[PDB]
Amino acid sequence: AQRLKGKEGRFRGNLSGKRVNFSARTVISPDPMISINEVGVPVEVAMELTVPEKVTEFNIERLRKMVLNGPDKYPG
Amino acid sequence: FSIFDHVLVPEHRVLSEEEKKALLEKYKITLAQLPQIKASDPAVKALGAKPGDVIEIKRKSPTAGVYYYYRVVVE
Amino acid sequence: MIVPVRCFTCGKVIGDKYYEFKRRVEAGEDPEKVLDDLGLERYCCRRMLLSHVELIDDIMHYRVY
Amino acid sequence: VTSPLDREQPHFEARDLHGTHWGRICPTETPEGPNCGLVKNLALMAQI
Amino acid sequence: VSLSTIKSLIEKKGANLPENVKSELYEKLKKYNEKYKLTKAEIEAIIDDVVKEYERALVEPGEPVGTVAAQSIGEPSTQMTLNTFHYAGVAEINVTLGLPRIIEIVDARKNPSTPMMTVYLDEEHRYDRAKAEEVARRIEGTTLENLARSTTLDLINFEFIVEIDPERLERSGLTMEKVVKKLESSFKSAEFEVDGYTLIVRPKKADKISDLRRFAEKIKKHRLKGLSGVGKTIVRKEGDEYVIYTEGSNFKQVLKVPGVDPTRTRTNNIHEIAEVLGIEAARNAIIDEIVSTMQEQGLEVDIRHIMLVADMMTLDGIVRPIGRHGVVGEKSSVLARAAFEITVQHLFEAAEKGEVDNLNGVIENVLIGQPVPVGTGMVKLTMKLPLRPQ
Amino acid sequence: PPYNADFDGDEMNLHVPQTEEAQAEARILMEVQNHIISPRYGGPIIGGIQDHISGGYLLTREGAYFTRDEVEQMLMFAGVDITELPEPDKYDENGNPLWSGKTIFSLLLPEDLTVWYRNKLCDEPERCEALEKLIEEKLMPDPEEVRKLAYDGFVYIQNGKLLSGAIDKKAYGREDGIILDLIVREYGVERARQFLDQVTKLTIWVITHKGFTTGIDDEDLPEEARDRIREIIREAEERVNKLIEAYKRGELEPLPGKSLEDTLESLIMAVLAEARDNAGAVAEKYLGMDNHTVIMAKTGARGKILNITQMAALLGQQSIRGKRLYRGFRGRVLSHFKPGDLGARAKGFVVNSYKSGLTPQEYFFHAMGGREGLVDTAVRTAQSGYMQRRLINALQDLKVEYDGTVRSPEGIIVQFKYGEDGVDPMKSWRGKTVDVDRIIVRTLLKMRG
Amino acid sequence: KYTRFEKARIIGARALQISMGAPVLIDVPPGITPLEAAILEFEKGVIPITVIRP
Amino acid sequence: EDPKDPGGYFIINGSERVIVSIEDIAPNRTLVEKDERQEKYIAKVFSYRHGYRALVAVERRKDGILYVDIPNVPKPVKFVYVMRALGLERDKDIVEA
Amino acid sequence: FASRHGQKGVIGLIVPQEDMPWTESGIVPDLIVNPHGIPSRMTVGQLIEAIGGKVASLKGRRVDGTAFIGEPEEKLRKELEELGFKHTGREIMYDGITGKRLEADIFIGVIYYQRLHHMVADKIHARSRGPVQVLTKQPTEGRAREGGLRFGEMERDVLVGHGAAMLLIERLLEESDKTEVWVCENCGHIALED
Amino acid sequence: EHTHLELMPAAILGLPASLVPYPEHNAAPRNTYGAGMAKQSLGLGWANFRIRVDTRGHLLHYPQIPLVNSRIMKAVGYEDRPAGQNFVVAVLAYQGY
RNA sequence: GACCAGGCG
Ligand SMILES: [Mg+2]
Ligand SMILES: [Zn+2]
Ligand SMILES: [Zn+2]
Structure with missing residues (x-):
């Protein structure tokens, strides 16, 4: 009973x-x-949270450039 | 004195059968969807309406000068 | 802990003239005349010497090796 | 100095300052949240 | 340009506008035409602009309008202020105000903490002070202790003695002997201690040995000279008309007093208004009370938010609270009621009744995880497949 | 303002949507510029705050003038796209061209705007009446005539040119802004955002380099003002002992509400409140507009007159729950007063200012009065939140159908038309369904020109 | 004529479609995220999706 | 140790504990009051013995008869009944007491 | 940072020395405070302390300010006037960028300030994926154990009020526990997979 | 008529609330905020912090004595363990930041 | 993991 009531x-x-x-x-x-x-975001947080993206024919170059930078340079 | 003279009471009126059918068809509803009013209410007592009929209320409001509200009599 | 080397606001070096001020003010001299003699004109520097505590001497008794 | 009353309830009469607090309880040092009034500090002249 | 031309043009170009707009437009057009000469093209363009502005200001279908109203009512309450002057002046009636009043109104309290009424006067007695005072005397209920100068107990003799200030007893309509005249027909056989200023209260139980004050207080609390419930009366002037404020509510009996204007008399009790004048008056009373209470604190809330709450509270023909034993208790969904309060009782009741939940609400769909029907989750769209890059 | 945030230790959360549908919903439905108008009362909520008003007043006041370098620097800093300075307004000594503040401010407004009203700085109403008459007689007055009769209390914009008035909280402040409200309803959200950014940055630049400060000498009254305040306080205290002695010897007709004591208390409180107001009147009178605190208070940027009269005059009577201080020893609040005392200063009255210091008894009374605000702010929120919870849990499921009706989930009709005219309060003209006179005036001005 | 809810739903549906293989009906500068491509398509008025209204 | 340390706290399992002061009510006084829900003139006392706290109240009501409340006794036994339990049964003794 | 008169705040910007203004007597401010914060709070004691501190630093002796017995304000103002400065406490400063003096005299003094222990280095926190509760398979709680923030009920009500249903679906379900369950259609019980 | 003489009215305040200079020139909530906030500032707490083992600790590199102070703090020993420094403050409105 | 105490907006 207590598991179903209260805050x-x-x-x-x-x-x-x-x-x-x-x-x-x-x-x-x-x-x-x-x-x-707009809002300012620290570079520490921006390198932790990630936004999934699907590679297409109009953004293959940028994605390939980003992958090469690895997880430690900012655009990556 | 009739209660309709009071400034807090808008005038009521009982709808005929054809008007009831037209209103029921216009909004595509049944008779259970409308707001209810008790049969012992002073207004319906003055009107003398039996259960099952529909009352039309003309309301004077600040946003719109006149606006119509409909209720169904239930005992 | 110990007297700062330079005044925070303007960077003038005042770290070498605290002991003389303390001694001459403990000898009964007028503090304003002593500060004027030492050459501290702007009060941003006088604030440094006038309000310092020597807390180094009572924390060396505890050694950590 | 702390009071044994319950924190959640308003307790309008208990949280107010009193004339007899002069010289025995500090009138300005108190918490800010729900503990306001119910937690107080001794004055400097106070002697138990 | 004639006024009839303006009227006809309004009646044929803006026929979809509300009546208030349709009248305000005519009034303003007459006012502006009576000092600058206007051509017909300007009138047509003005009407077109008004029609377009009204068209673009409508509500988008699917809008979550209940949540917005609830938030717009709740949020300003966190900045509520309180004054509570408590002035001894009869002009300023001690009435609860602010957030407690809002709580009382929304919760639909059966009887308010400070009941009060506003009583207007008819065409006669309206512009006079003495007639208003005697009407207020008619309304106000008077007991023995009210007129009494002072009293004194006689426990040694097991009797009670009452002394009355003449300035009240003689002006109270009834007189010293009329009290005994009425007491001869009501209650029990009194002691008939008629001595003008000096009255002796020695009921039958108050014999020589015991049982004093068993009936003495009851004789002292006898109901005479005015309606029940009302314990005070105050006379005021507001502009060119005198009005009367009272303590307590006796609306049903108050409407029967001669000289009292019944078309504008009202009270601050909602249930009494509902029982006397019907639900449609209770709706307007709730709206006016909420609006006045919110305005007196300096805040500003649009009427359309209050109208929705007022309409929702009176959907079954009787005023009911907003809470556990009110509107929330009338929801069909089991989970929507269970998530609010007293979960176990609701769950067991639904288990007994064999109730069915159709998941037509908002909270239940959030609990399951499937999309809600409120906003974007309402629309549906189609696609023609054989598409090629142009 | 919409976040109700302040930079003194506050924290905020940040969430990142992951699916393309969520990103599209956030981009289309949740943009900041789409929520300039508040749905509660149909007025602007996002706008200028604090310095954005003081800088505007400094820029647009009477007699303000700027040199070439300041004008070029401020226009470049604001971000305005300009490649040619307008004609100079007046020449200083040695023939230095000068531009007025109104000319600089006019470069941000759209080209076809026109509006007029009265702001908070109205002191003498007999001078705005002439301007209103001139506007009424001829709908498009000659700009020279308007410039000859300018006044800070009457704002007037003609075809994008600011002809009279000064910036105030009513220009683009929260819940009072007029120009912003007109812009958001006639040009779109994007133009409003551009105007907001440019005006904020320009006002910030104006306030940064002209200099703005307050000091201890801002509450220095002359001797005669102090003498008048002292006499006012003296007479106010004197005319209370007479009431006290009258009550002490009967001779006092009680108000019919409560007993004699409550009537005495009410009379005393009324006298004290009137005394405080009268004392504050002279303090208001003797401080000119040149003082920076008066500038910062009378324009709605920060504070109010009560703070000024509390800092430069007596604090006034303190009270708890609407009644004078009575808690304490039997018959007296503090041990330093004789028992059974009803004097003005023996139950809460403070005859000192924050500048002149407080005696210990007045300090204790002030603390007793001040505890109430803290306890009230601690107590009210619980029941406020409970009421909001109930309201939000009762009215959650009501939508708006394609027919314009509001229906419960089961299908019961609640309203046959939302509100009573189907008008969104967010899109209404300050509650009104439509502002007729504004449309009439703007159409007449557009055609008759 | 679209209500903002319908516009948001249409833009979201098209943005989801583009990121799975559906060809773009208009030329787009390189490096543009699919949502921006859907927005550009919508403001160009070439979106083929339609909404059914009772 | 720091000479400035004033002392007055315990050391429990390597942690420093301090005992705050509780602001209790008087231990044996008699306090009278009055509530508005009735006409009760309630006088309540707290009695302390060997750490045991007992609450005892005597009051009147509309009947005019004095009643007494005792711990572990649910019913408010009348005043004369509880007085005669302790002796002094004669009616003179009660009034003299 | 916070003084002892009840004024608190956080550092907004760090400025190079050459950009700060300087008084014509050779003083560069160590701190800048907005004048909009003074009138509302009515902390005249801060101004009194500033004047007293500047006077004390000039005179080479500390100033007593013990409650109701401390040195009166007028004495401090007269002493400051004697020492050569202005009794109002104002000075003339030059703009640090343009290089010309401002139009108004500026109040300036010395004020005691304290640094609180609520540093930003102990409050930054961010989570993408991490450990979950055993019972409910939801993200853990607390900065110390890589927990996640809580999406309370009024946040859900706000999302409903905006009307973003898909945002609600993403935030409340996709970024939290999610699973697939086999359901028997004939009887309604949950099926079993071997 | 008097029967007693007050020793020192300035001593009715508590220990942390006595740090505020000129406390009678401020509003009560601001004095409360200052008194509560005076218990959180960084400074040299105790002389033996090096040996002392604590879960958390802080230390200010260059603490200073306040220029304007109450005479009570000298008596109670606060000057030997200060916390805070003196700044040169200018009341000026800068570019928004 | 649950409790207790103290703080921040
Ligand atoms: Mg804050
Ligand atoms: Zn220096
Ligand atoms: Zn099965």
Whole structure:
């Protein structure tokens, strides 16, 4: 009975909300030199989170260039 | 005095059968979809309507001058 | 811990004139006259000597090898 | 100095300052969250 | 250009507009034409622009409009302020305000903590002070302790003595002897201690040995000279018209008092309004109460968000709360109710009843993981296959 | 503002969508520039804040003038695409050309804009009436006539040229902005974003190099003001002992609401509040517009007049839950007062300013008054969140169908037309279904010119 | 005429289709991510998908 | 050790523990009050003996009869009944006491 | 960074020395604070402390500020006037880039400041894939064990209010536990695979 | 009429709340924030930090004595273990940052 | 993994 009720039960604790995979957290600082629809991202976080992409005929060159840089240079 | 004189009460009216059929067909609904009103309500008591009929309400509102709301009488 | 070598704001070297100031102010002299004699004009440098604590001498008793 | 009351409830009467606190409880040092008022610190002249 | 031309042009080019817009346009066009001369082309272009602006301002189908209204109501409440002056002036009636009032209204409290009424006056007695005062005397219920100057117990003799300020007893409509006259027909046989200023309360139980105050308080709490429930009355002037504020609510009996205007009298109790004037008055009362309470705190919320809540609360013809024993308890989906509160009771009840969940909601589909029907998950699209690069 | 964030230790989360459908949904539905208008009240939520208003006032005030290098540098810094400077407005000594602030600001507005209103800086209303009359009589006045009758209290833009007025919170501030509201509803989101970026950067440059600061001498009143404040406080305190003694000797008709004591308390509180307001009036009067704090407060950038009158005059009466301080010893709040005292200063009144310091009793009273804000902010949020939870769990499933009706999941019709006219509050004109007079005026101006 | 929900759904569907092998109906500068290609196709008005409305 | 260390804490399993002070109520005083849900004039005391805390209350109500509440006794036995349990049965003794 | 008068903040930008303004007496600021933060908080004690600190540094002796017995403000202002500066505490500065003096005198002094232990090097965190809970096969909790952030219920309500259903599907299911189950169509129970 | 004389009104404040110079010129919430925040600053905690074994620790390289201070801090020994430095602060609005 | 205590917005 206790597993199904409360703020840590199976309903309000896991089903309604759950922990996700691709996320980051840090402090914020002002920057008025960027447009309102942009955000600054540290290079440490940008090298950890990844965006899957499918190689096609219009982006094969850039993808092949990126793969050569490996996981330690920034574009990679 | 009739309750329709009060500023908080908009005038009611009972729909005929053909108007009821036309309204029911226009929105493609059955008679269980409309909002309900009790048969012992003072307004329907003044109207003297039996269960099963549909009442048309003319409401004066700030956004729109006149707007029509429909309810079904249930005991 | 120990007296800083250079004033933070302007970089002037003041690290070698703390002991003389302390001795002459403990000898009963006027601190303002002593600071003027030492050559510290801008108060950004006087702030360095006027508000320092020698905390090095009471932490050498603990040795870590 | 801590109070044995429960934190979640409002306790409007208990969290308020008192006239008798003068010289016995610091009037400004207190936590900021729900613990406000229920946790306090002794003054400097206080003697148990 | 004649006004009839403007009326005809409005009635044939913007026939799809709402009535309020259709009247405001005519009023403004007359006002602007009476000081600058206008040609017909400008009128046609203005009507076209108004029609286009109304057309582009409609609601996109599939919009999640309930969540937006709920958030737009909830979020401003976190910045609510409170004053609570508690002024002894009768002009300023002590009434609860702010977030507690919003909680009371939304939760549909059976009886508010500070019931009160606004009583208007008819064409007569409207612009006078003394007539308003005597009408308020008619409304206000008066007990023995109200007019009493002071009292004194006689436990040694097992009796009670009451002394009354004449300025209230003589102006209270009823007089000293009329109290005993009514008590001869009501309650039990009194002691008939009629001595004007001095009244002696010695009920039959208050014999020489015991049982004093068994009925003395009951005699002192006798209901006379006014309606029940009302315990206070206040006279005010708002502009050119006098109005009356009271404590407590007796709407049904209050509507019967002579000289009271019934077309504008109202109360702050929702259930009483629903029982007296029907559900359609309760909806408007809820809307007005919420709007006034939110406005008095300085915040600004659009009406269309309050209208949806008011309509949803009164869907079954009776006002019901928003919560565990209200609207949320009427949802057909078992999981939607179970995830909210008292999960085990709902689950066992559904297991007993053999209930069926159709997964037509939003929360249940989120729990399963299949797409929700709210927004983008509503549209459906088709493709013609034999396509080639042009 | 929409995030309600402040740079004092705050943290934020970042999420990255992975599938192309999610990326498309985020790109089309969740863009920042698509949420300039708030759905709660149909007004701008994203706009200028703090320095973005003070810099604008410094730029567009009366008498502001700039040299060539400053104008070129600010225009390049803002990002405006310009390749030729306009005609100079006035010549300094040695024939140095000078440009006014309004001319520089006009380069950001679209070419066909036209609007007029009154801002917060209106002090004398007898001078805006002439401008309104001139506009009313002739719908397109001669620019020279308008420039001759300019005033900071009346904003007026004609064909993209700022002819009168000064920037304020009503220009492009949150929940009050007018120019931004017009731009977002007549040119598109992209133009609004470009205008916002350019105006913010230009105002930041203006405030950075002209200099803006506040000091301790900003609350220095002359001697006569202090004397008047002292006399006001003296008479206010004197006319309370008479009420106290009157209550002490009967001779006082109680208000019908409660007993005599409550009426006495209400009268005392009313007298004290009126005293504080009267004392603040002279402090407002004797501080000119030249002071930077007054500039920063009267333009809505930060603070309000209450802070000024608390810093430069008496703090005033403190209270808890709407009533005077009564907790403490039997008959007295503190041990330093005689028992059974109802005087003004013996129950919470503070006759000192933050600048002049507080006596220990006033300090204790101030702390007692200040605890209430902390406890209220600690307590209110729980029930506020509970109510929001109930509301969001009750009204979640209501959609809008293709017929315009709102239907519950089972199929019951709740409303036969959303709202009562089918108008989205986010797309409404400040609640109104449509703003008729604005359309009429803009069409007449477009054709009659 | 499209409601923004329909526009987002169409763009997402086309972007998903392109990244799986479907040929592009317009020329695109190299290095462009498939979502940008779908956006360009949509604003050029050559998208073949249509929506059925009750 | 640092000479500035004031002391006054324990060392448990290599960790430093400190005991805070609890702000309890008076240990044997009698406190009176009044609630609005009734006309009860409740006076409650806490009694301490060998670490055992007992709560005892005596109050009146609308009946006018004094009642007593005792731990492990659910029913509020009347005042004269509990007085006569301790002796002094004669009616003069109660009033004299 | 935070003073002792209740003013707190974080470092926004680090500036080279030659870009900072300098007073005409030869002083370069060590810190810059926005004037918009003073009037709302009404911390006059910070200005008092700045004036007192500058006076103390000039005079070569510390200043007593013990509550209700400390040195009064007017005495400090008069002493500052005697020492050669201006009683208002203002000075004249030159712009560090253009090279010409600003139009307004600038308040400047010496203020005690403290560095809190909430450093950014202990708050940065990012996760792509990692260990999961045994019972529910969801990402772990905590920075110390490579956990993931929590997508609470009001975040789901916000996503619903925007109307992005596919975003909800991706965030709540695809990036969390997901599995395939064999279901018996005739009776409704979960089938078994050998 | 008086029966007692106060010793020192400045001593009614607690230990951390006494660090704020001129505490009677500020708003109460700001004084509360400062008093609470004074318990988190970095500085030379204890002289034997090298030998001492702790899970976490901090150390400031060049601590300094405040120029404006209360006389209580000298008596209570705060000057021998300070935390914080003196900055040259200019109140000026910079370019947005 | 669950509890306890203390902090941050
Ligand atoms: Mg913050
Ligand atoms: Zn230096
Ligand atoms: Zn099976």
